[PDB]
Please model this.
Amino acid sequence: LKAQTKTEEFDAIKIALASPDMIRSWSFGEVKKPETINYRTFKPERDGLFCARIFGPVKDYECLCGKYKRLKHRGVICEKCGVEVTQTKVRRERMGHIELASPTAHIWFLKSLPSRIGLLLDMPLRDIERVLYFESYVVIEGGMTNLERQQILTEEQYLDALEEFGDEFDAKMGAEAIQALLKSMDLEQECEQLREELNETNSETKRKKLTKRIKLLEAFVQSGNKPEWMILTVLPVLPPDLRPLVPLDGGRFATSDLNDLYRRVINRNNRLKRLLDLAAPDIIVRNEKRMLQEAVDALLDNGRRGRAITGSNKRPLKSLADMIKGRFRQNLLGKRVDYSGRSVITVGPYLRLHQCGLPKKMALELFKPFIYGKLELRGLATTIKAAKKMVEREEAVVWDILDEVIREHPVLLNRAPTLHRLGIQAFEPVLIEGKAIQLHPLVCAAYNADFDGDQMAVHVPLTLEAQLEARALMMSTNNILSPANGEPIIVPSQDVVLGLYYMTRDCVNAKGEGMVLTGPKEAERLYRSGLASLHARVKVRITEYEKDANGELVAKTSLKDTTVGRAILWMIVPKGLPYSIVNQALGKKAISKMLNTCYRILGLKPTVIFADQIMYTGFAYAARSGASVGIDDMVIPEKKHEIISEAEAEVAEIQEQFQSGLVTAGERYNKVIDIWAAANDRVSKAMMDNLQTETVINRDGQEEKQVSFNSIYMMADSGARGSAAQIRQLAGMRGLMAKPDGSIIETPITANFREGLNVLQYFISTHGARKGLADTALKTANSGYLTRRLVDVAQDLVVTEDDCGTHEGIMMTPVIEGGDVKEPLRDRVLGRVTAEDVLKPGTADILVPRNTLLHEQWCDLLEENSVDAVKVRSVVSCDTDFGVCAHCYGRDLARGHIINKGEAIGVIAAQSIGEPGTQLTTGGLPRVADLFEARRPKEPAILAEISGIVSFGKETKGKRRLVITPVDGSDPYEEMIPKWRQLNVFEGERVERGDVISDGPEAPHDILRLRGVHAVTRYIVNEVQDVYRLQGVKINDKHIEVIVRQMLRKATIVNAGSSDFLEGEQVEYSRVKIANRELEANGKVGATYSRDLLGITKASLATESFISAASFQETTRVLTEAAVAGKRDELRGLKENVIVGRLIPAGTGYAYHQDRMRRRAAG
Amino acid sequence: TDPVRMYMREMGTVELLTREGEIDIAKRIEDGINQVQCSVAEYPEAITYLLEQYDRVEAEEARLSDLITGFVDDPELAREKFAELRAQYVVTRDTIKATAQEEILKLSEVFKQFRLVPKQFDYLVNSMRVMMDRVRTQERLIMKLCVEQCKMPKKNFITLFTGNETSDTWFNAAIAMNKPWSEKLHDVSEEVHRALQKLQQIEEETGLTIEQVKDINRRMSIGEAKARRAKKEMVEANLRLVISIAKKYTNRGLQFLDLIQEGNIGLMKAVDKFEYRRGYKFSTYATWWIRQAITRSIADQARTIRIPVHMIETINKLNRISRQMLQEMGREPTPEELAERMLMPEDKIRKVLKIAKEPISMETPIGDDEDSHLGDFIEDTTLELPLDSATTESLRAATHDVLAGLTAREAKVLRMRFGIDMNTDYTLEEVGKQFDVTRERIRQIEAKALRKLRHPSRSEVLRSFLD
Ligand SMILES: Nc1ncnc2c1ncn2[C@@H]1OC(COP(=O)(O)OP(=O)(O)O)=C(OP(=O)(O)OP(=O)(O)O)C1=O
Ligand SMILES: [Mg+2]
Ligand SMILES: [Zn+2]
Ligand SMILES: [Zn+2]
Model:
């Protein structure tokens, strides 16, 4: 096989220092003049910052002088001006360089927080600078005299030390010195010193810093970089079109600020080159050198000195470093895209689930290149030039052609805050008149789209893949379940659930009461003819199906006891569902679980076509219902004024007690709030008693009352719109308000919205409203910063291996919070795969065997027996190094089957957590951050460190020591405990390691250390879920568990035999190497470690790929600290593969990277 | 830190000169330059080369400006004054028969009058020291071949070397000494005796034994350094003067220290051209040399688009006029009002006024909510739009199909007349030489091919590329 020279498909990216020899390879000339363009002719002065000899021709294939203008001449250098005739594009590629007179320090390696030039020398920054500005000499290889190597001298001292040792002793000042220091420095020799020093002196103050430095040093030898190279002899210049000098209208010019920065460096360098041939006094050339140092620094990274200002303008100049940022996460803010558009969105309830209304005009412009081709592919246009003039003329036939290109061609729709993956969904386009985008009403819930002015954007899948990706992955009908909780995200929303609740309803005596109907068909015939009422108790012969056979629909026919409305709805329910699913009252509650069961029983397609029919019929009968809302619909209880006066009486007595000194002011305010709080609860469930049932009606007899049919009640009872907390503010009094500082005002708002509020009440209602808009505005921000921190710790996590093969898993129970089951077992365990065989109340009997995916049948076979706990494989335990086995993860998706290889569960975990983040409230959304950031609480409890009988030692010295004493092992553990914090440990009781020695909150860091990995992962999920489960948010523990896996990504070594002693590193890398040690290598020299809990942002900080880190971390430090290591980025990951524009190593691209990672490191 | 401080602090240590100390330095400056001038006058090659270059001036191979700028106290005087130098050289050359030292005194006299161009002065200075590199070149080869290679101490090698440094008295006569360092010099005998040719040759070109070759350019070194040492000494005393002057031209578009450095170069020139005998205060004489270099620099490197000085004074005319015209009117001048008050072609004001505006920071924040910068909005006009490049790939296949609908030699004559699928287009005569029958014959092949394509059957495709 031949090697290669030119250009094939690159893998990996290496970064390093640039030798001055390296820097001249890129340059195609030295810039020697500060000139830009000429000033009359706007041509570029030769040997200037803009130049045709150095960089490239101004216009395509035209020499600068003009003797060679023809496109024939290409690889030709004009004999006058050193210009080859190629495209003007090379003025965008070709770089230059400048030969510096005096050496110049690279600001980044001198000044990025840990000074590389500093600790590579073990020299302080206030000293290096003092040597760099010529204030004091430094010795270099001082030899056997009176002075050390890194010793620093002054003017007078150097003179006194020169008269004693003339030669055999060398001391310089300025950049030439620091260059010599790094040059004369030997890395391997200093390595051998740091290795003998580590072993000779045993001291934690000695060998804690010793190890910290040496890892960079020998990384530098191995890096290949040379220490002299942090001193710049050659400064490369950026191609001009990347800092251009384009003209504007009116003949005014604009240019990148670099040109002021590059010009200055050249001028001061040229002036310095002069000051040497003028043999100037050192006092001047020193000042010039200092300015050249300053000029270069303001070019590379302005801001780390005195911040030079731009010409005539107060603003500072944007340095090269700022070309890269422009503060944090500045390369991934977004990019504008061809084949796209947006407009206002409106309804369109006629739509099938998999389609969307696209304007005649938008679809025209968007598919323009498809129309052009499809036009002359059929011959309706001679050539493309006329094809344009056709669709410009909008001839009638281009419309009929547009349908042809549009048909099997999905489009993407995106709404503003893209929270989870459902924010972009692919639909099939329906050509519509008007300028509005028509959106299917069921997919509204996913997008969080109202129709109050919200807009959506559109995108065209161009390539064949993207069309199939949009069709098979992003399609509306392929994502009907939320990936945060296997429940349907395509629920009927409001307008529709009112319709079905109105249908599946019954009133006491209605037209048709008691007749018997052959089937559902004659039941719709009875209603559309005005004979039977939609709600009348009525027996109808129905047939239902049940697939209780081995995959076969058993039929059963009976006279079920239902109503006329529920009869007609049965005509929609598909095949194998029980008639019981519609026999009830069908609110939004019951109407979604109806939809769920259809998916779990009949499958995807029959569920999609179901949801459509539920919406069509829901809209229709909701519109037939004539449901409205008038002023008399908000029924105030007749007993309201009574309740008010009564609590108004109690407070007058609590006041009576306060006057006489019987009760305190703090008690009064507290006791008065309680009787008002009670009165609001009393008015509340007074109006709801009246409102709900007072419809007293009559059937053949006297009286009988039922659930009301009043408009505003049905809206709430069904679940369409409205909530009992809100209704209470309309009829009953509306709450107690909070005055600004946080107190709740002791006289509540007695009035409501059906009455008026007065000046004082409304004025007090204001603060709650404004702090409401602010709180909900801010908690929309905090969420968005959470999902960032969350994908930054995940992102690269992909379902890679099939089955890691483990029995390790967390023991799953119902949460049972104090009172009763705050979360069943069936929910926590459904969709997960069992770790080992589960047994009946009696054994010998496997009920589900080993790793089976516990779905709805298994969960019932579990719920039939009395199984109260199931060990479940979890992501935090998946033994796959670099990723997650498909088994240990679970099943969940917008589809119902076990996760497929390659899906990027890292992202979709993080998304599912931060998407509901808006709706939370210590507690609240920061309480989530506190957990995921692993933040230690202020006043923690201490846990029992080691097992054994405990006792107290010494006395009060600010710290009261505790001495534990194990039965067998060593007992030297003594902990200094501040004894002004009340303790809970029994002072003569044997304490188990991990028990309460004091009370109060606990640090997760302990939990992981003492009680284990399985305990901390349990502590997080149950504690964050308490935040979500309190707000009524369903997030599967799965997603929190993948975040936790990233939190304990790292470990710290305890024993050795191979690598370091204390370093922190990935269990993936460590476990991969002590598994490499149980055989091969040594018999088992393997090291032990200890899992380390990191907060998400601390865990995200540790990324191998520096391109990923230069995205969100501080770009200077990442680039410097990586360039000194000569670090290689192998790509491999997600973030970077986006930055460089290639296939993601997941999804459809997962097959590509798997075929690539194997050809690599092979032949 | 910040260089302004440490420069201010560095030169603040330098002490102001007394009104007497100014003369002490200008005297030491006098000595050093005069010392080298006496050493330049003692060099025979410096006399012959100055005569070499004047035999070039009388043969019209140069001008009198290219060699001299005047003597002590133009074509008339130069021809006879050069004969005086020629006369004084040719009498000295022949009296070496030792006692010549009385007449070599006069050769320096007539040579110390010549004020050459600074270009030529440096060359002769370069000629002398490069001639000393030639002397030392053979000096260090004999040292490395005797001491390092043949193991010979340096105490006995330089003994008979002083006063000689050319012959074999130190080489082939010191091998017969039977010393422990003697018999070993035979190994390199073949290597040293052949390289001695370039050494004793310098005694011929320069006409001086190697002894004299150092003696002269050593006093020239002593004198040359003596001047600069004093010249540097003068500059530092006035670094405050440059500061105070540069403090005036501050915000004109150039950094502060950039000014006090360019002024510091004006102060450097002032020390060179200063003549203390004219009694004018060195401070006031440097004021013009310092204020020159500042303002002469602002003209060059204060602009991104560099403009000539006559433009900068043209510009100020408009600004000073538009300060008057502005208030003097109450509105302000139209581009054709100061056109009259300017002697300029008065339409040039517009063209002048265009380029006077410095270019605009492309990183100017434009003021949006996305903090959009100006440069983010300047579109690429050099680019060919894909909806066009698409048709270019189509106009290709169009003309290729239409050209296969011609007679075979009509393609090769059409694709030759236009640039199609060939390098360059061909003059119809050049096409004629390719095709035997030439000239008018080809013009009809050209016309008839466009004629077959112009009838609406082959045109139907091509015509739709016109709009
Ligand atoms: N992906 C999107 N999904 C939904 N809506 C979007 C999307 N992008 C923009 N908008 C709306 O378009 C403008 C802002 O556009 P942009 O931020 O300035 O960017 P670009 O100038 O490049 O268009 C606002 O709408 P409005 O101006 O009507 O006011 P609003 O923000 O209160 O709705 C945005 O909602
Ligand atoms: Mg809205
Ligand atoms: Zn040219
Ligand atoms: Zn696993």
